[PDB]
Design a protein around this nucleic acid. Structure first.
Lengths: 111, 226
DNA sequence: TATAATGGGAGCTGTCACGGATGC
DNA sequence: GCATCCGTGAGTCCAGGG
């Protein structure tokens, strides 16, 4: 169903803040923001969709996503706060796309 | 949820299939209800003060403390509660009952408590001299439902008692939430001075907590039963 | 790169035997 | 099982083509 202004703003906000959280998690852990984004995405989506990424220097394999998820889960509460932020952001991202699929159709019927 | 009409249920609690969620909403399924977009946030700020009242000694029901609604005295005839200070009147009428505060210059000089049954005979901002009637108590006067009398000290003098009540109550302040704002505080949480309640795009539109209190959420945009 | 925009169009017509697939 | 309701691929030879 179609987003209300409130649901729209909420999801967009969650996306922005999850991206900021990935940046903060890169600052803390010294990992690669892309690697972190991919691991958070791998857990939000599921192992149903867990493939390799062309930019990542390390093959994204369940083993490596589990290792990185564990390195993340071992952080102090005030740091591990950003992991929950990022997971919330990815879920919002999926939901925001899915909610706006109809606008693409209404534009593409003209080309 | 239609505009303005409030929820018949509260955020966090389980509900039954078919159990109505609002005057025009019935839940097809069982589970935990959840609030979507609270459009009014009411904060009950907690106030603990000391106040006084003079009563005939015969009409007084001596107790060490008074719970709300409880009878505090019974007067056989009308009785005029009179001021024991000169000052300017500050009348704060709660849901039930009132507080008079007389103030001289920029300093408070007396704090009187009128429980239920006492009709205040003065208007806010009024000048009063000692002995003039501030309020009239008919009888069966009792505590309001919203305020409680923690401790009660008494002084006998002539044919009267002067009660020094350590009262504790809450005063509500509402806030209207706009669609571009998000409540960052859960239902029933305890804020201090300076704690943010609702965030907004620009800081001058934020909702920061004046004093201590609890948070209550009203009129959600919609309700999500999960 | 920023007003806002949220579910599509096209059909289309004078055959026939046969193997497999659906209703009785 | 016993019928009916379907999909599907098929239809001489040559030539030229606009």
């Amino acid at each position: 169903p179609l987003l209300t202004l409130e649901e729209e703003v909420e999801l967009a906000r969650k996306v922005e803040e999850g991206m900021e959280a990935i940046k903060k998690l890169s600052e803390i852990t010294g990992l690669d923001p892309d690697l972190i984004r991919e691991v958070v995405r791998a857990k939000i989506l599921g192992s149903a969709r867990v493939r390799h990424i062309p930019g990542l220097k390390e093959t994204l394999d369940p083993k490596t996503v589990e290792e990185i998820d564990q390195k993340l889960k071992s952080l102090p509460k005030e740091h591990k706060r950003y992991l929950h932020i990022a997971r919330e952001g990815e879920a919002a991202r999926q939901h925001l796309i899915e909610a706006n699929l109809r606008l693409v159709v209404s534009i593409a019927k003209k080309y | 949820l239609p505009p303005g009409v409030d929820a018949l249920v509260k955020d966090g609690e389980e509900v039954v299939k078919g159990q109505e969620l609002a005057p025009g909403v019935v839940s097809r399924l069982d589970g935990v209800a959840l609030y979507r977009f609270p459009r009014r946030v009411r904060v009950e700020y907690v106030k603990k003060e000391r106040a006084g009242l003079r009563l005939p000694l015969a009409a007084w029901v001596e107790k060490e403390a008074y719970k709300p609604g409880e009878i505090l005295a019974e007067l056989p005839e009308p009785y005029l509660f009179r001021a024991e200070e000169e000052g300017v009147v500050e009348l704060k009428e709660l849901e039930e009952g009132a507080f008079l505060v007389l103030r001289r210059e920029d300093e408070p000089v007396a704090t009187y408590f009128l429980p239920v049954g006492m009709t205040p005979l003065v208007v806010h901002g009024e000048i009063v001299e000692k002995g003039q009637p501030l309020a009239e108590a008919k009888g069966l006067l009792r505590m309001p439902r919203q305020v409680r009398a923690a401790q009660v000290e008494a002084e006998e003098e002539g044919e009267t008692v002067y009660l020094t009540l350590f009262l504790e109550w809450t005063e509500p302040k509402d806030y209207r939430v706009q669609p571009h704002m998000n409540v960052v505080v859960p239902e029933g949480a305890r804020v201090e001075a300076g704690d943010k309640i609702v965030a907004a795009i620009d800081p001058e539109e934020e909702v920061i907590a004046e004093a201590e209190g609890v948070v209550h959420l009203h009129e959600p945009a919609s309700i999500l039963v999960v």
